[PDB]
Amino acid sequence: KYSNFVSFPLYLNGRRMNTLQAIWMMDPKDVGEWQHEEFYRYVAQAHDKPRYTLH
């Protein structure tokens, strides 16, 4: 809930929790169209695709 997007690897009993990139800090020319949909499905907690994308 709180520190999912830490900039360093995080381990809890061996496994790692971050497993995601902060696409709002990266340049638009360095992120593909596939990550733009997976990130949306995480923040919106849905299973559909976005019809618009503003960066």
Next chain:
Amino acid sequence: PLHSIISSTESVQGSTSKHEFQAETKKLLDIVARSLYSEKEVFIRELISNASDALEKLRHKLVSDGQALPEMEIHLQTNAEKGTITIQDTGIGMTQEELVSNLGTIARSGSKAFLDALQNQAEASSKIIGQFGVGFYSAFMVADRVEVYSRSAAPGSLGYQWLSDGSGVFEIAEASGVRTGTKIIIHLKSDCKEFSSEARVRDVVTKYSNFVSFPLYLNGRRMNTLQAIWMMDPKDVGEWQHEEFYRYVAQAHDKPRYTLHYKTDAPLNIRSIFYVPDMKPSMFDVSRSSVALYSRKVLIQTKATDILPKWLRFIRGVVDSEDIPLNLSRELLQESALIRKLRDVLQQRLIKFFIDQSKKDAEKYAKFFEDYGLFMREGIVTATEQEVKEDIAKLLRYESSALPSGQLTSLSEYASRMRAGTRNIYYLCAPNRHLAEHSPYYEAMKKKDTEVLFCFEQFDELTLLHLREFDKKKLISVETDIVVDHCLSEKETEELMAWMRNVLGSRVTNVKVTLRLDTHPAMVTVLEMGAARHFLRMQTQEERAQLLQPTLEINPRHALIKKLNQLRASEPGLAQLLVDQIYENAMIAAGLVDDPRAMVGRLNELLVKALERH
């Protein structure tokens, strides 16, 4: 009817001449642009592959001298009002001589000569796609005017141009202000205007050249961020990378339950990855193989070869191999010997992987076998070699009477605790263990101290009779064993026996007496129990019993037979109804009844008239 005109009268008289082969430059373009490529949008796969090769050559030229690598990009542009497409890269480019020695000659490729002068064939041979030299002319399928702006990357070259219309004549001139690289402009035809929208173009770049080695920007936004994880060593990829890749290829939002990373080179070069979905298989899995071939990081679009066995269609992944041959259409040489042995190599590795999973974990494998157990049974049915049958059979799981309930045993584990010299395997079919132990067939076999498997799910009888052998051991069903092996007074039984020989002279062909029953009133035995249980499903009652030979057995100790004795004196009318129901009860207990709706009418008649004394 034998005659021929073959002789040896031919001879040479004059001095022999010499000549060389020519080629017609007009029909060759017509053949390539009309009857070579089946599908139309393959003209940008060739253009992208050409672009990705110029960048590779430039990078190789800037590492021998240790120079700084500039930006490497591939840009796609689509126009609607002008109806044009655009491709641009930043490769080595082409000089004036290179624009005519490569773009002007059919079946001539400059990339082939580049590798021939390397003398290494180690790192660049596996990263260059061009092999034939005719892929550029695929643009003429949808284009009437082709336009190329290119200049070499050499320090001091000049910009040039290249115009043609596919009529065998092309014009070349000089241009000013051309950026280093190569830009190609295509004017779409009247009937080929579908390639002017982002929706159509995006559906092709992703399908064919999604995993190109260099960044690709379509009209401003890139689509080349996800990297190919099937090439590097498995030690470099984490759990998250495996999870992310599966969601893309399988188009699923869940987590894979198994992952395999196969890399072999001694028999043949193979790079592949396989995934097993966690969710229970859907009906689309059964109805047709979720594996796409890749060669040098471009789709091959097989969709008709089935490089993986049909029983292994439930796994998702990709296979990469540079040893497979391809024809002029960039597709497989169908039914080739090399593509046949790859399937056998892949099949044996997958079976071995599942066996190792069972040893590593049993509770996880039990869940997997419950879900995807249908495919393994189908593979045994649709196989030919016994070695193939036995290899798949190791994945089957059953439970036996010698072990506590709820515990599954393998065939090999069962095959380690027989007697000294008994080459027999016993199995019994039943819906539940409650009916398995209470089955009359099992009760007759309690006389021996042996272990028998209990198979519950359907098609188990069909699968076992098709296997027919496991480790040189014969598979014998319990019902087969009972036939093949080799109270009431006697006076009170001989007078009773003649009745059902007459009143059931049509549906019954044999009635005998058997003491081996303790909790069941009657037993029905048939010679070919396995065949009769399955031939009935493929295919009234008199016909169903004529070819069945329903041998019947009785239990003198049972109270039902004891109570039927006085049924002679008091009410002989009810006697005919009761004996008919006993036969039907035994038939259902023997599993030789397709549907019990017919006997419902007689059951109601007996009940409403027999228990009227309450």
Next chain:
Amino acid sequence: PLHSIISSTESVQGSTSKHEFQAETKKLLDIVARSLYSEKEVFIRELISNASDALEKLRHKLVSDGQALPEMEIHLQTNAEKGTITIQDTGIGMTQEELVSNLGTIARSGSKAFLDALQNQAEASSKIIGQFGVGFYSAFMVADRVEVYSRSAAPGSLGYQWLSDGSGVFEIAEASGVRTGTKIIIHLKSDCKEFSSEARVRDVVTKYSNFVSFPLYLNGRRMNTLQAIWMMDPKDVGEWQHEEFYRYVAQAHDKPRYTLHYKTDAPLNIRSIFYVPDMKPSMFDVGSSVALYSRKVLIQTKATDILPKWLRFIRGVVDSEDIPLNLSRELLQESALIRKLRDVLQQRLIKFFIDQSKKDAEKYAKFFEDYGLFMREGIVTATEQEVKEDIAKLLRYESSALPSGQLTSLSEYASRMRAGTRNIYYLCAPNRHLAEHSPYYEAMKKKDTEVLFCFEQFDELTLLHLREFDKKKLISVETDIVVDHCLSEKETEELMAWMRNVLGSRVTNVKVTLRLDTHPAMVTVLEMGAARHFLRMQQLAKTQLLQPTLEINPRHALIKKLNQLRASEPGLAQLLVDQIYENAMIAAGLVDDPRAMVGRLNELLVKALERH
């Protein structure tokens, strides 16, 4: 912002030069040698096609002069001693300038010039195969040296000799003693000596060019031995020839029961034949032996499925002279024309069966019983609503308002249906005896509507997937009951709630129904069709409960008997209540495996009969 570098800063300032396209034959021969044909034995098929083309050119030249025709036959020999294969014919022949023009040039064929110089497009436009010009070079796959001897048919032409090794250079010289026609001496490569055996060659000839239009021989023994009736008219061909052809295409021994001769050329040229076997469908049944032909040579697609999937039981051959072909002489995958060819054949085959039903009603009845599975499958495996109805007209059912022993279709069922009614009622049962006595039929006996009886399995699924016919809804008897809108009330209700206390675990809701006469109980659910499949579809495959509403007939003796059993034998009454539930469950078709009820059934009769 969008990261783009596409601009329009380019300009033209130089001079325009003119150049022509070139081609290197050293690499062009490389492509054809191994990266063109998947199979290795296709070289003989090309040579036979080339030999037949030579004879066609000679024949058309004679009819122009109107003179007698000499012998016309093709010979091929195998010489296993030195490992050579020879093909000879009596064609037109080629001169020294014709050798270099045709043989020495890639992608250039002399047939197209002859075809374009016809100006009628009927004499030879339907019998010339060659259209690419690279067929001859396919022989380099297995040949390390090629010898060609030929003399033209002109009265005075001389022979010539032609040598090549596939290295990009060929040799031409004058030859003496070569007779009219063409002869090709081929020396086999070390790894491809299997073609020196007669058994291997005989397989290929009968596989690709078995139906050539000229007398073909192998070691002097003729191999054609039959004609191609699919190119002829329906009237000249007799039944005996119509019977001999069937035994060859299907590799069968019986006689066909149906025969269709289809010949149309308006949308696209078709000359095809079809056959329906007499024997029952085999286990293997459940290119489908409809192998496509073009110019009397096999195309060997085996994957395009020119015929619909449900039409996998009929035999025959399809011929077309306008199918687009790949450079490797294979059908162009995913073509617009091939899609319209499949649809055209589907309509004609469906129409043919409709006409056969009207002409012979009894014959179609026997045919329906044998191959009924395929028709039902096609309805389920269809996507268009119109095509589903086209297949639906072939179905045959039995109605309640007619005597036993006759069948009626659905089209005439709607022609005898009342104007107010706008739906069709159907009932599922093994036999008509079990259909009339089924409780659901007796519930709907009040009205005067007509209900069809369907016996064979998956009939309800076929109707469920169809759901429409002539814009009339299909509603089963089971569906109509739920949507429809002596055991005193005090005695009944108090005993009625007793069932709830002991059957509430399974029977969620329960009521009393009075429209019964002989069935002591019923079981009804909302989605009877889905439940009768879903409860059986789950138990079939381990892949991806319900609310059984049980009805009680108060005027039945068995139900009336339970009134005086609660006070006397409460323990035995519970056994009878469960048995009644099982009996009604079986008659509804939703029962589980009946092995379970055997144990409970036996335990009831052992105690209930303990009084005599």
Next chain:
Amino acid sequence: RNVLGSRVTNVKVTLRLDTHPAMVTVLEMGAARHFLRMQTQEERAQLLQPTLEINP
């Protein structure tokens, strides 16, 4: 049924009415009333099942 078949799926008779020539009965009348206002006769009547009863 011939003239209102598109809009009416079933017609019946009620003898309990004496002051109204027409009556419409729906399975879930309360749910239909509130759901209709939030969301021409053909597509509306498809989701309402407007059974028609006429007092003779």
